[PDB]
From TrEMBL, chain A:
Gene3D superfamilies to which the protein is assigned, alphabetical: 3.40.50.11780
Annotated family: Belongs to the myoviridae tail sheath protein family.
UniProt xrefs under InterPro entries: Tail_sheath_C, Tail_sheath_structural
Superkingdom classification of source: Bacteria
Protein name: Phage tail sheath family protein
Residues annotated as domain Tail sheath protein C-terminal: 241-348
Source species: Photorhabdus laumondii subsp. laumondii (Photorhabdus luminescens subsp. laumondii)
TrEMBL record, chain B:
Family: Belongs to the myoviridae tail sheath protein family.
Domain Tail sheath protein subtilisin-like span(s) in chain numbering: 214-306
Matching Pfam families: Phage_sheath_1, Phage_sheath_1C
Tail sheath protein C-terminal domain ranges (all copies): 308-414
InterPro entries xref list: Phage_sheath_subtilisin, Tail_sheath_C, Tail_sheath_structural
Protein name: Phage tail sheath family protein
Highest rank taxon of the organism: Bacteria
Length: 349, 416, 118
């Protein structure tokens, strides 16, 4: 078996699981892990590429009583890619060290403090919270403990499956897998809702239209409901801030992806002469990317002049003081497409 | 092998080679615990990695004096230097104990080698590096020499005799493995017994076959060192890597281009992962950082010197002036003993003006026309007086304008 | 003769007796990377009190494999032409001892594929 001595065929009868892995660049999550976990103790972070790698490093059979094990299984069965495991106490110290992380996933832990520090404008991070573990209060005060952060979202309720025990799967683990699947399939600008949840996962509690009507404005909660024909779907794509900007997860996450891609596109211009020939080279790099994004359907507008604009130059974006200080300032304005959320049927005879 | 018959010979080995590069404006000198194959303290010119292995014993163990042993990173640091685009270099091996006589002679030994432009100390020991850096007098640095230094701390900058002529980098870099040498390639000296003189033992191999007792004494220190370096990882000072990057940047883009935003090669990992907030603190203090970016890799992310002012803040500005005053000085060495008269001063002005025009053509200087980029002045009542001329003096004033790099790029995003 | 640079490879003969289960049936061979050993000796229809040495048949396999699939392809997992059969049977447990260090190459018969170089 594992000991290979003679050339030929070896037979063994195992029961180890086997799953599949996707590849999405805009969804690289980091999972908060309890400090008592033996695998994470003594290390800053652990990178997991697939279920095969995690099982090999664990060197143990799949335990449904381990919150980390079920969260990773739910995440990987939903199409998630490679992720990072970081202890909850080390989030504010290790997340800035990691450059490719885009999602901050609360895998059943409490990451309220880390989100309020890390998820800020310009940091290019989005957070996924966990909804209340109990029933929903009909007074509309089941979301009082969440901060109105436009860089985070909450999902309710927790999920169970065939391989479940006294502990229930946190919804954030499965949702993060949905993020990877939708981005690689239809793009980051498409709402990560109205999509099935893979596996045998089912919501622990039923949510009706009347219940959801209270938690769809202000600090909204995104629901995981079951419908008579379509199975179990993610129903809700609103962030924690109710504003004409950043109301919807697609708009906030599209700008996060565009900022990261643009930053990588023109990063060649650092430590170059701060003159007009450099500015023209940077403008070409930004315009080339924005046109490509518009062609894919990620921007709203019939022609590129209606979808984006780029400005850079002297007395347009920067002054003499900015140039003498080594600063180069660029202005980018892009229009995002907002989905249809309410459908009204009018019947008459 | 030793060839006897004409024809083709076949050998199986593992010796590694690197492509040899060339340059003039970046020739570094390495001060460290090297092990020359010849006993005869003096600076030795090395043209390539092959030449180094022919003149020096590569390895991670310093020569053994009888016993004590030392761990050295000089050989691997040189390998990283050649892998990153390094050209010919000079090597100054430090043998036996670090005496004050050696430290005082360092500025004179370097000046004797006329081609030196860079000074590098490729040693992991922090105390050893501090002693070497303090031995570089302000007269040596102000004479057109640049020191690349390894900062040992993230929070406090290094202190040298001349701030504007020094650049520090942090942190060190890890490598996959060290260069291991056979027993015959490890220098051994000082052994003596009743039947043998002190000069009859030269390497570890001869020591083993003459006295296994002290040979076992030496190997347990070697094995202890090999265990210690394996625990911490094969850490190499980063100054040697930066020396190669300086050579590659000058040959490709020119001295006026910052040596930053270049990808490192041959390394495995950095000794410490840095964030943007930490790098913000170092950059203000003058410590350039080696950063890791997922879409790029390991890159140099700093171009500042230890002096923070509007004149000598950036490495490319400082190095360009060093190159210009070096080339101008070379041009005026054909005028030293000419008669001190007006026709001599006219020839001096023409020589400098011709050189400066060529510099402006390549884009080294700023401005839309030569009058905005440089000026040369020399005269009987403009720069020098009658007393200066009677004393054999000749005074010429040169001014240049350089282009500063862009360090911060700000993106402003709008919803509509 | 078999030294680096000489461009020669040697084909030996395995023991003529049964294989010792202690793993010491290859103690008389030098650890030369330019040589190989094959076991056991072969017999055919046209055979008598003497048995064909395995090296003679193996060298023929070398010529056929090289001309067919190149010198970089393993000269194993190929049938031995003619009616040649191994004189002694080798199992997976017997070969497990002599497949590391100074390894012996075996010629085994399999239920469907006939006699193969293993």
């Amino acid at each position: 078996t594992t000991i290979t001595t003679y050339p030929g065929v070896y037979i063994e009868e195992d029961a180890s699981l086997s799953l599949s892995v996707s590849s999405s660049a805009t969804a690289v999550p980091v999972f908060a892990v309890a400090g008592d976990n033996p695998l994470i103790s003594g290390k800053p972070y652990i990178r997991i590429s697939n279920w095969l790698e995690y099982l090999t490093l664990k060197n143990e059979q799949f335990d449904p009583a381990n919150t980390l094990d079920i969260s990773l299984r739910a995440y990987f069965i939903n199409g998630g890619g490679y992720c990072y495991l970081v202890q909850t106490t080390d989030l504010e110290k290790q997340v800035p060290k990691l450059d490719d992380v885009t999602l901050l996933v609360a895998a059943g832990e409490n990451i309220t403090t880390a989100v309020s520090t890390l998820c800020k404008p310009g940091k290019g991070l989005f957070a996924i919270f966990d909804g209340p573990t109990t029933e929903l209060k009909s007074d509309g005060t089941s979301n009082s403990d969440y901060d109105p952060n436009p860089f985070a979202a909450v999902y309710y309720p927790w999920l169970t499956a065939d391989w479940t025990t006294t502990i229930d799967i946190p919804p954030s683990a499965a949702i993060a897998g949905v993020y990877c699947s939708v981005d690689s399939t239809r793009g980051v600008w498409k709402a990560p809702a109205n999509v099935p949840i893979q596996g045998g996962l089912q919501p622990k509690y039923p949510v009706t239209d009347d219940l959801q009507a209270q938690y769809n404005q202000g600090k909204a909660l995104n629901m995981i409901r079951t419908f008579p024909k379509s199975g179990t779907l993610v129903w809700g794509a609103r962030t924690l801030e109710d504003n004409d900007n950043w109301r919807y997860i697609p708009v906030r996450r599209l700008f996060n992806s565009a900022e990261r891609d643009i930053k990588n596109a023109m990063s060649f211009a650092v430590f170059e002469p701060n003159s007009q020939p450099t500015w023209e080279r940077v403008r070409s790099a930004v315009n080339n990317y924005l046109y490509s994004l518009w062609q894919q359907g990620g921007l709203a507008g019939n022609k590129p002049d209606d979808a984006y604009f780029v400005q850079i130059g002297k007395d347009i974006t920067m002054t003499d003081d900015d140039i003498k200080q080594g600063k180069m300032i660029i202005k980018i304005g892009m229009a995002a497409v907002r989905p249809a959320e309410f459908i009204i049927l009018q019947f008459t005879q | 092998t030793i060839p006897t018959y004409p024809g083709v010979y076949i050998e199986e080995d593992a010796s590694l080679n690197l492509s040899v590069n060339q340059g003039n404006t970046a020739i570094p000198v390495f001060i460290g615990l090297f092990s020359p194959k010849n006993t005869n303290s003096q600076v030795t010119r090395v043209n390539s990695w092959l030449d180094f292995t022919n003149l020096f014993n590569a390895g991670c163990i310093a020569p053994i004096t009888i016993v004590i042993v030392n761990y050295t990173t000089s050989s691997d640091a040189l390998k990283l230097y050649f892998q990153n685009g390094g050209g010919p270099c000079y090597i100054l091996p430090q043998l036996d104990r670090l005496t004050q006589g050696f430290l005082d002679s360092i500025p004179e030994l370097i000046k004797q080698a006329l081609e030196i432009t860079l000074i590098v100390c490729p040693e992991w020991d922090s105390g050893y590096q501090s002693k070497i850096y303090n031995s570089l007098t302000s007269s040596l640095l102000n004479a057109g020499y640049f020191l690349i230094a390894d900062n040992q701390d993230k929070n406090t900058a290094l202190i040298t005799e001349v701030a504007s002529q020094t650049a520090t980098y942090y942190p060190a870099v890890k490598v996959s493995q060290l260069i291991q040498a056979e027993d015959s390639q490890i220098a051994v000296s000082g052994y003596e017994d009743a039947k043998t003189k002190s000069d009859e033992v030269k390497n570890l191999a001869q020591l083993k076959e003459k006295n296994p007792t002290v040979y076992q004494q030496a190997v347990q220190k070697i094995q202890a060192i090999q265990d210690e370096i394996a625990a911490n990882g094969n850490i190499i000072p980063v100054s040697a890597v930066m020396a190669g990057i300086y050579c590659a940047t000058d040959a490709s883009r020119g001295v006026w281009k910052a040596p930053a935003n270049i990808v490192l090669s041959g390394i495995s990992d950095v000794a410490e992962r840095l964030t943007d907030d930490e790098q913000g603190e170092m950059n203000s203090k003058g410590i350039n950082a080696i950063r890791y970016f997922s879409h790029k890799g390991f890159v140099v992310w700093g171009a500042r010197t230890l002096q923070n002012d509007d004149n000598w803040r950036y490495i490319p500005v400082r190095r360009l002036f060093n190159a210009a005053e070096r080339d101008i000085k070379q041009a005026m060495q054909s005028v030293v003993f000419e008669p001190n008269s007006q026709p001599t001063w006219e020839r001096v002005k023409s020589a400098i003006d011709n050189y400066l025009y060529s510099l402006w053509q390549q884009g080294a200087l700023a401005g839309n026309k030569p009058q905005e980029a440089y000026f040369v002045q020399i005269g009987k009542d403009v720069t020098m007086s009658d007393d200066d001329i009677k004393q054999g003096k000749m005074i010429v004033k040169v001014g240049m304008a350089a282009v500063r790099p862009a360090e911060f790029i700000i993106l402003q995003f709008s919803q509509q």
